[PDB]
């Protein structure tokens, strides 16, 4: 079997991407944030605290004839950005672009933190990191990818995020028309539950390539590219007027600037992020100071190859016996 679904940026900045997901019987379509940095499929629901729902589409398990309460199961997650959500669990039919999983754990939110409520475009998350990070207690649950894997034509999923445009998430196959050149595969460590790999270095604009090992995670659920301070300082040193701002909480730069590109290494291959991908607009409405798309990972503890990096490439999340990551230009 295969699945194919269009992913769409939630706003003019590509702050996040939403993909329609069918849940239950009859189908209840919710737009979820496919996140390769977490392993919980959670949704806004009829059980979510009323004051914490503001515009989101909710899943109502009582209206689904295939929904079954997972007795005694609860979930509670806290994300790297300080957001959090928790609630109870149901098992139900979940479909992504033609691909169907019966008995998938659908985590129904009872409580969500402010950032989730404030984002009316995101109805929940669909985790695609390793099932070892799933928060369901006392019985840990599997991800949608893990549940579909045995049924897929090939045990893979691909991320093809667009820059200010729609993209695609494919399950079970590699679309050879969606990229240029060839796909370079690289080693993955699953020890932290993430799609964690090692980049072979970087370049800033037309600059000379620096061979240096950068350990980080391929994370579709993170907007920006978080890299070591030395690397991020080398990047922003090429932008006239760019500075690290403690009040804004990152590198900011004149909105009038034209940004240089950023290249990252995948083995002997190179993914080039065009400069326009690194512009995240005014720091506050009407400001002439813009927020950068390349930020330091010093406060995080892990480097994150978020959407800024991933959207410049066709990305293969290979769930074979030994998982690997494939990257190709497009
Ligand atoms: C991810 C994280 N932080 C941001 C954005 C995206 C976009 C704009 C912005 C403006 C000021 C401060 N942070 C951000």
107, 42 Cβ separation under 8 angstroms: yes
Does one domain contain both 182 and 282? Answer: yes
Does one domain contain both 152 and 183? Answer: no
Nearest CA owner, ligand 1 atom 1 = 223
CA distance 98 to 299: 40
Number of domains in the chain: 2
Find out whether the beta carbon of 16 lies less than 6 Å from any atom of ligand 1. Answer: no
**Last residue in a domain, options 174, 203, 238:** 174
CA distance 289 to 283: 6
Find out whether the beta carbon of 283 lies less than 6 Å from any atom of ligand 1. Answer: yes
Does one domain contain both 167 and 236? Answer: no
Does one domain contain both 118 and 224? Answer: no
Does one domain contain both 138 and 162? Answer: yes
Does one domain contain both 188 and 61? Answer: no
**Which residues, listed in sequence order, are joined to residue 318 by a DSSP beta bridge?**
156, 324
Intra-chain end-to-end CA distance of the chain, in Å: 25
Find out whether the beta carbon of 317 lies less than 6 Å from any atom of ligand 1. Answer: no
Phi, then psi, of 277 in degrees rounded to 5: -65, -20
Cα angle 16, 192, 42; round to 5: 45
Determine the 3-state secondary structure of 14 from DSSP.
coil
The residue with tokens 């196959």 is 173
Find out whether the beta carbon of 248 lies less than 6 Å from any atom of ligand 1. Answer: yes
CA distance 105 to 177: 33
Does one domain contain both 179 and 41? Answer: no
Structural domain range at position 273: 175-330
Closest to 195 (Cα-Cα) out of 314, 319, 16, 22: 319
Determine the 3-state secondary structure of 221 from DSSP.
coil
Determine the 3-state secondary structure of 59 from DSSP.
strand
87, 107 Cβ separation under 8 angstroms: yes
Q: Calculate how far, in angstroms, residue 252's C-alpha sits from the geometric centre of ligand 1.
A: 10
CA distance 32 to 111: 17
Does one domain contain both 56 and 122? Answer: yes
Closest atom of ligand 1 to 282 CA is 10
Does one domain contain both 161 and 207? Answer: no
Resolution for this model in angstroms, one decimal place? 2.0
Nearest CA owner, ligand 1 atom 10 = 283
Q: Is residue 162 packed enough to be buried (19+ CB in 10 Å), middle (13-18) or exposed (0-12)? A: middle
The residues assigned a catalytic role are 35, 199
Phi, then psi, of 133 in degrees rounded to 5: -90, -5
| Cα distances (angstroms) measured from residue 165 to each of 6, 8, 87 | 10, 7, 33
Does one domain contain both 121 and 222? Answer: no
| Cα distances (angstroms) measured from residue 125 to each of 28, 249, 291 | 15, 25, 25
**Last residue in a domain, options 118, 150, 174:** 174
**Last residue in a domain, options 174, 203, 227:** 174
17, 123 Cβ separation under 8 angstroms: no
Q: Is residue 112 packed enough to be buried (19+ CB in 10 Å), middle (13-18) or exposed (0-12)? A: buried
193-215 burial, b if ≥16 CB within 10 A, otherwise e? bbbbbbbbbbbbeeeeebeeebe
CA distance 328 to 326: 7
Dmax (CA) for the chain in angstroms is 60
Task: Write out the E strands in 3-116.
Answer: 3-9, 17-23, 28-35, 41-43, 68-78, 84-96, 99-112
| Cα distances (angstroms) measured from residue 198 to each of 80, 179, 207, 220 | 20, 22, 21, 17
254, 266 Cβ separation under 8 angstroms: no
Does one domain contain both 157 and 223? Answer: no
Does one domain contain both 150 and 191? Answer: no
Closest atom of ligand 1 to 248 CA is 12
> Which one of 291, 293, 300 would you pick to mutate in the ligand 1 pocket, going by the greatest count of ligand atoms within 8 A of its CB?
291
């Amino acid at each position: 079997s295969t699945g194919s679904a269009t992913t769409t940026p939630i706003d003019s900045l590509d702050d996040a991407y939403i993909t329609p997901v069918q849940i239950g019987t009859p189908a209840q379509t919710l737009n979820l944030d496919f996140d390769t940095g977490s392993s919980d499929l959670w949704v806004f629901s009829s059980e979510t605290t009323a004051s914490e729902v503001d515009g989101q589409t909710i899943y109502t398990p009582s209206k689904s004839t295939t929904a079954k309460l997972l007795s005694g199961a609860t979930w509670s997650i806290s994300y790297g950005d300080g957001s959090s959500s928790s609630g109870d669990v149901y098992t139900d039919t979940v479909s992504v672009g033609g691909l169907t999983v019966t008995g998938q754990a659908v985590e129904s939110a009872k409580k969500v933190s402010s950032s989730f409520t404030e984002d009316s475009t995101i109805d929940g998350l669909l985790g695609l990191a390793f099932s070892t990070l799933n928060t369901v207690s006392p019985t840990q649950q599997k991800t949608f990818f893990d549940n579909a894997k045995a049924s897929l034509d090939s045990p893979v999923f691909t991320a093809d995020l667009g820059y200010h445009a729609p993209g695609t998430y494919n399950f079970g196959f590699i679309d050879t028309t969606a990229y240029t050149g060839s796909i370079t595969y690289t080693a993955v460590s699953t020890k932290q539950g993430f799609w964690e790999w090692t980049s072979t270095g970087y370049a800033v604009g037309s600059g000379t390539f620096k061979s240096t090992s950068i350990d980080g995670i391929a994370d579709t659920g993170t907007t920006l590219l978080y890299l070591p301070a030395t690397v991020v300082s080398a990047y922003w040193a090429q932008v006239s007027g760019a500075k690290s701002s403690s009040s804004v909480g990152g590198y900011v730069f004149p909105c009038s600037a034209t940004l240089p590109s950023f290249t990252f290494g995948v083995g002997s291959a190179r993914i080039v992020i065009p400069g326009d991908y690194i512009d995240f607009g005014p720091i506050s409405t009407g400001s002439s100071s813009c927020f950068g798309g390349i930020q330091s990972s010093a406060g995080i503890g892990i480097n994150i190859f978020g959407d800024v990096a991933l959207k410049a490439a066709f990305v293969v999340f290979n769930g074979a016996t030994t998982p690997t990551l494939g990257f190709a230009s497009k």
